[PDB]
Design a protein around this ligand. Structure first.
Ligand SMILES: CCCCCCCCCCCCCCCCCC(=O)O[C@H](COC(=O)CCCCCCCCCCCCCCC)COP(=O)(O)OCC[N+](C)(C)C
Ligand SMILES: CCCCCCCCCCCCCCCCCC(=O)O[C@H](COC(=O)CCCCCCCCCCCCCCC)COP(=O)(O)OCC[N+](C)(C)C
Lengths: 392, 392
């Protein structure tokens, strides 16, 4: 833990705090209500979810290292240059500084020639360039490993599914709103944005063509084909076929939600039965993922609970109360997770859908933040598939 | 070096940087030229000089610890809770955050009932309360020791002059502008400020009564009586009587400057001879302090220079170039130091005097910042009076 790294973490955090406060007062006072800000909120929602995910991942690394979870061995990382929680805090703070600067430039641009629509373009282009720059520049090893993971995950059936690919695909499953906002950004730029004055003032916000439904299922598709690949490598059905079944319930729920969405403005009598199928598959998907979490992901509700009631025997975290609020928050937010996926899969809430999505996506990142703790603790305690060698 | 301390240093530094930038744009755009801002600049000049002194003192502690200067033994500090450079950076950043917040409130006050003249009052009252709070609150040991020093320095003839009293009196000699702005603050509040609207829109800025001349000589008076006390304790004249002579040259230069100032508006023919005496004593004071610096304070220009030309034999700092720019900057700024004392002692520059003082006081703090390095290095190498036991 070098002193300059901690100093950079504090410096970036302080600049981020003051820039967030400035953003707040700018929104109340400087921001004008004439311009529609929803596309801006969607683009910067994708950015903010990425930064929040990095910050919560830093907290996750802190918890793993100071609880005993050997995440370095589980992630199959070299125990020489593994990213510490401080480095994740530094990256999150730096990208948050860029995000806040881009947002402030969108509110008031202190440049006469530069237009407003380039600040999101410049911000996300800077994220991409920082990720893919060939030179041995900041954190070269970390982003090279991350880029290899991003290549292996998005081409799943052709690579053996290790722990890192599975984990990253699940994080993308929680961060599907980032892909959704990226697709919305591309569609808005290509179709709806007038490259004349600004990004304020749309066909890309509905399911006229249903492309973002494929985008929504993309992380579920990667996880589905990863489970199928694991079945192909190891001819066993209990973990992998049932997990792929869970992801296919996500598939059916999303597509039935989309069918109901297009059928409202259409008007066939099959709309009511498409509803009924939607609640059926919504309940199936929500309970499937929730029971999978508590039983196979977290490992709780074991029959060897002992003193730790409604939990497992071995526990590495200090307070059982943490496990209990984790269970409660998982039950609450898994239904909200399916709800937000459903409304993002439909167009029937053009009044509240945007706000409920914008306030539930950070809660979904927080759910996966809590999910990481107990998932990797369960993997550390007893192997779940991806070790095949020892318990640790 | 705890991680949280470095994090706090970085956090305070980042907030300070962003608040300084915000202050800059507020001054260019938000600030209105109708209100006179000179009293505001004087009050916050005192505050800013204190914060700059703390930051440069942190740099001094860094240099002393990583060059070999045993400042803990020289300052007669307990080697258990001695303030590190990080703690000084933390204090400077925190007080700078308060200073920036008070200045921003003076520019735009987001409170309808609270008037503008309380933000400097609240800021300096908070500094005083932080310094003198009886409870074992932040840095209790450090400020208790500092308060004991502040008591021993301001009552000099009745205490034996140790190194810490001498050093602090010299720092106050460099920071006499802080006392000047404090006296101006008190006079402005008691006489010129109308407690109706604000502090903007004076008899306290001239020498109608000549009280701030006594304030200017107060640090020189403390050093003068400290040298006399050291003569009384040790009956030797070469160091102490000559040093007291130097401080008395400061006395004569200040009082002759004041006499010339009052005699311009008076109009006697003795004004020209008071001028002539002023340049005589200005040159005497400037060369006295400058030669004292290089010869007795820093110890340079020794006859055992050897390879280190125009310097001394033993050198703890890496590059001799540092010593050379230090000599050049000392020759340049000692004349500027006497110049700023003279114009603050007079009223003949009511056009440029305020600005030259406001830009030379930070340069005077920087001169004492450079002076600390070589003074305590000289004391570390060979004893100068205040050891009497060993060379170290
Ligand atoms: C509208 C929204 C548009 C969004 C824009 C597109 C997204 C921009 C993408 C760029 C931002 C991501 C910044 C990169 C941070 C990655 C840091 C990282 O991966 O640290 C990890 C830390 O190691 C760990 O596994 C512990 C914590 C788990 C790390 C999980 C990976 C982080 C995933 C975050 C990016 C996900 C991509 C999101 C795309 C939407 C890699 O470690 P290392 O490489 O340094 O050490 C391994 C040893 N070697 C290297 C030798 C093999
Ligand atoms: C208009 C302008 C008005 C200005 C307002 C009035 C000024 C406000 C005054 C309050 C601000 C000062 C904040 C206090 C910081 C002091 C920190 C400090 O003294 O650290 C020092 C660090 O120790 C050192 O000696 C090394 C560096 C040299 C320290 C020099 C003292 C600092 C002087 C700064 C204040 C000067 C006062 C200025 C008044 C104008 C004390 O160490 P310690 O007490 O923690 O450890 C010693 C062991 N014991 C305690 C057991 C004996």
């Amino acid at each position: 833990a070098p002193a300059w790294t901690t100093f950079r973490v504090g410096l970036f955090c302080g600049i981020f705090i003051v820039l967030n406060i400035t953003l707040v007062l700018a929104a109340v006072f400087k921001l004008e209500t004439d311009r529609s800000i929803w596309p801006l909120i969607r683009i910067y929602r994708g950015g903010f979810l990425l930064i929040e995910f990095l910050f919560l991942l830093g907290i996750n690394t802190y918890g793993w290292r100071q609880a005993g979870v050997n995440h370095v061995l589980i992630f199959e990382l070299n125990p020489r240059s593994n990213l510490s929680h401080q480095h994740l805090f530094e990256i999150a703070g730096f990208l948050g500084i860029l995000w806040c600067l881009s947002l402030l430039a969108c509110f008031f641009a202190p440049i006469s020639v530069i237009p407003t629509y380039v600040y999101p373009l410049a911000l996300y282009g800077f994220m991409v360039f920082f990720l893919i720059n060939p030179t041995k520049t900041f954190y070269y090893k970390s982003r090279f490993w991350l880029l290899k993971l991003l290549f292996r995950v998005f081409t799943a059936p052709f690579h053996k599914v290790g722990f890192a690919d599975f984990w990253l695909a699940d994080q993308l499953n929680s961060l599907s709103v980032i892909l959704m906002d990226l697709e919305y950004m591309i569609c808005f730029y290509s179709l709806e944005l007038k490259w004349d004055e600004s990004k304020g003032l749309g066909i890309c916000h509905k399911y006229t063509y249903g492309v973002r439904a494929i985008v929504q299922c993309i992380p579920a598709w990667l996880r589905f084909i990863q489970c199928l690949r694991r079945y192909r490598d190891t001819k066993r059905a209990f973990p992998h076929l049932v997990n792929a079944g869970k992801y296919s319930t996500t598939f059916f729920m999303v597509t039935f939600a989309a069918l109901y969405s297009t059928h409202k403005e259409r008007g066939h009598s099959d709309t009511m039965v498409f509803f009924y199928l939607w609640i059926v598959f919504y309940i199936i998907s929500s309970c499937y993922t929730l029971i999978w979490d508590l039983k196979m992901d977290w490992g709780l509700f074991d029959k060897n609970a002992g003193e730790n009631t409604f939990l497992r025997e071995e526990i590495v975290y200090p307070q059982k109360a943490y496990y209990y609020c984790a269970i409660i928050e998982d039950v609450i937010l898994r239904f909200a997770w399916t709800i937000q996926i459903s409304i993002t899969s439909t167009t029937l809430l053009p009044h509240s859908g945007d706000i409920i999505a914008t306030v539930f996506a950070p809660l979904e990142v927080f759910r996966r933040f809590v999910w990481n703790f107990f998932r990797l603790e369960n993997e550390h305690l007893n192997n779940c598939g991806e070790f095949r060698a020892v318990r640790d």
